[PDB]
Write a protein that binds this ligand. Structure first.
Ligand code: MN
Ligand code: MN
Lengths: 19, 293
């Protein structure tokens, strides 16, 4: 019912999109 | 309100050489300041929001960097957006910035939300350049209308009962969320108290409890303050802006808090980058960073 805040860097995916 | 025409003329300078302005009719803008003001007063002062959305920090009149943001993250309503105050001042194009935001707000009032910053206040934007910009390009009374619109801005938001978003940070007077909801609008920013600290306070690596803020206003707070506040209200993250950061994002207290700044080369006196936290529906947060050469 209540979701949790999970970082992409924390969960195995790149954190940053460059442009 | 002839809205789609206004938004169209505001995006007409995309791709042009930066620095070119957009001057709307004095009445058109005053319409934005009324139609948006009504929408603010209807929606809650403490915004209950649902992911997915994108969160952006200080803009500070840097209008062509703001256009680069939307050009990157998608023009609404392709994405949802939450903004953390500091729309005006410092930059040369505050009027182009604030108008395009207020227009989108009216355009998609359920998929576009603007939060108040410490510069969305007469006594502040009188000093730092939004007042001189209104007097020059238009007149004084339009600035007073802007002020009457800023007074009714929402203060904070909560993304799915887990992420807490305000411009500055925490206040020692804030023990329950009802203290926020009970605040009435329109309202000026008092020099002290809860509402002031939400837009002025700063996270401090060096102090643990509370400490004096070098701004001469509000307080600092430490990594201990963030751990107790997230626990008591069953929260995972605090999202804020208000301070420049090198990468555009900067974590604090073991990724418990994040500082966002969406203005690259902040008033031409920094090498900083602009960032933007993309949050999918599952509350998974990855950043998109703007950067010059
Ligand atoms: Mn600020
Ligand atoms: Mn600021």
């Amino acid at each position: 019912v209540k979701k949790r805040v999970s970082f992409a860097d924390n969960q195995g995916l790149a954190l940053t999109m460059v442009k | 309100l002839n809205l789609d025409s206004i938004i169209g003329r505001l995006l007409e300078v995309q791709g042009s050489r930066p620095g070119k302005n957009v001057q709307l009719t004095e009445n058109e803008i005053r319409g934005l300041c009324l139609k948006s003001r009504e929408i603010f007063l209807s929606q809650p002062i403490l915004l209950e929001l649902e992911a997915p959305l994108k969160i952006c920090g200080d803009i500070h009149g840097q209008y062509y960097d703001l256009l680069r943001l939307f050009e990157y993250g998608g023009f609404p309503p392709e994405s949802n957006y939450l903004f953390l105050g500091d729309y005006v001042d410092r930059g040369k194009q505050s009027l182009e910035t604030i108008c395009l935001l207020l227009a989108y707000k009216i355009r998609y009032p359920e998929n576009f939300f603007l939060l108040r910053g410490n510069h969305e206040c007469a006594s502040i934007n009188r000093i730092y350049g939004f007042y001189d910009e209104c007097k020059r390009r238009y007149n004084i009374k339009l600035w007073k209308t802007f002020t009457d619109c800023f007074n009714c801005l929402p203060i904070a938001a909560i993304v799915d009962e887990k992420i807490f978003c305000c411009h500055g940070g925490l206040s020692p007077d804030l023990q329950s969320m009802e203290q926020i909801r009970r605040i009435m609008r329109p309202t000026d920013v008092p020099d002290q108290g809860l509402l002031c600290d939400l837009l002025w306070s700063d996270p401090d690596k060096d102090v643990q409890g509370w400490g004096e803020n070098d701004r001469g206003v509000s307080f600092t707070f430490g990594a201990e303050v963030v751990a107790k506040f997230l626990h008591k209200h069953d929260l995972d993250l605090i999202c804020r802006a208000h301070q420049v950061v090198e990468d555009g994002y900067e974590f604090f207290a073991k990724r418990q808090l994040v500082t966002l700044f969406s203005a690259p080369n902040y008033c031409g006196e920094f090498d900083n980058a602009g960032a933007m936290m993309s949050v999918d529906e599952t509350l998974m947060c990855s950043f998109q960073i703007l950067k010059p050469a």
